[PDB]
């Protein structure tokens, strides 16, 4: 299938340049244009430019004239975007997407979250969320992982490597003194825990970490 | 640049009803080849956008028959008949006729459903958090509708405002409910100076608060 693997999260200093990449598979890379799209948190989508890998022809949104440089590599079927003179205004998710014929963005990568900041990367601490010793649950019990103290965004959480997805609720992060936290909770039948294993998988791409934690009663 | 204006900004809809999303371009967007490169995308929470409709009215592969696009000139419409729970997210129109390509300002489809009361859980800090010098007490309110809710914290009977932060999920894909965490974070020292910790949730579904409480025995 058509897929794009994008770098994921990047942290860069104000005034620095950062490069991000989009490795394409599932089609003849030189047949289709690669486009980049910017999305600022809670905002809409903004088209940046495209490159044709076969000739290295590029076209830009004039707003990104001196901000973005699109390049590509045939042999490794990878598209690149460099962003220069970074400001907090460049903190956004950047998608690559190919364009087809008749239609454009049939397939989009997952997006790279870029944060522009002077602060350094911090992997999250992860704590279990489990009922007090005297808590009396009815037919379900809710358990979780509190993910605290990380920087930059994002963190994602899966339960049993992705196999528990029913009744998962992962709330939005909150920011406090430069660090983010969020909780991810799952609801299972009371008869299934603690007797069966419930594990949270906490991914923090800026620190290249997955934290796997078995959740147990206090 | 071609301005792509969408209305409404937000679109509340009951399951099974029809939603109509309008897109007005600032100029015509017929390309020199006679085609109109007008697309509709749906972006679900935390996902890439996905293509729905192309060249105005053409359904992309796999898109259900209940999504249809129409229009011409400067006026385009996406219709979704028989809305389903997983149709929620932000819909964007897009023109790929004039460089720079531009997207619409976005319409958040939201599901209306019957009211639902929260299930409340309170979670004492883990002893694993204590050497951080912090202690988080988490109040979790699960599966309620509508989104607006009040949470009050008490510590040994006295109400508290500082150190409380709140986070929400997006509307559920399946039951169309919301959930939210209210987290009281203290220093380990404050945490250990006190005994009972209560969160009380008040929601339009009942005049009675749902009160959850523990004591560090």
Author numbering:
A (entry chain H): 1 to 218
B (entry chain L): 1 to 217
Quote the passages of the study that discuss this structure, keeping the authors' original sentences:
An established carbohydrate-based cancer marker is the Thomsen-Friedenreich (TF) antigen (Galβ1-3GalNAcα), which is typically found O-linked to serine or threonine residues. The TF antigen (also known as T antigen) has been associated with several human carcinomas, including those found in the pancreas, colon, and breast, and on this basis has been referred to as a pan-carcinoma marker. Here, we examine the specificity of a potentially diagnostic and therapeutic monoclonal antibody (mAb JAA-F11) that was raised against the TF antigen. JAA-F11 preferentially binds to tumor tissue over normal, and in vivo it enhances survival and decreases metastasis in the mouse 4T1 metastatic model, indicating a potential for this mAb to be used, after humanization, in cancer patient therapy.
The overall JAA-F11 Fab fold in ribbons (heavy chain residues in blue, light chain in green) indicating the CDRs (heavy chain in light blue, light chain in yellow). b. The conserved disulfide bond between CysL23 and CysL93 is shown. a Values in parentheses are for highest-resolution shell (2.2–2.1 Å). Computational docking of the TF disaccharide was performed with AutoDock 3.05 to identify possible poses of the antigen in the Fab JAA-F11 binding site. Pose 1 from the docking was both top ranked in terms of cluster population, and lowest energy, and explained the specificity of this mAb for α-linked TF antigen. Protein residues (yellow carbon frame) involved in hydrogen bonds (black lines) or hydrophobic interactions with the TF antigen are shown. b. Depiction of the stacking interaction between the Gal and the TrpH33 (r  =  4.0 Å, θ  =  12.1°, φ  =  90.3°); the geometry of this interaction is comparable to literature values (lower left). c. In the case of JAA-F11, automated docking was able to generate a 3D model for the immune complex that was consistent with data from STD-NMR experiments performed on the same system. In all cases, methyl glycosides were employed and confirmed the exclusive tolerance for the α-configuration at the reducing terminus of the TF antigen; all β-anomers led to steric overlaps between the methyl and the mAb surface. In the case of JAA-F11, the 3D model can be further employed to guide the rational design of peptide mimotopes of the carbohydrate, for use as immunogens, as well as to guide the selection of key residues to be included during antibody humanization.
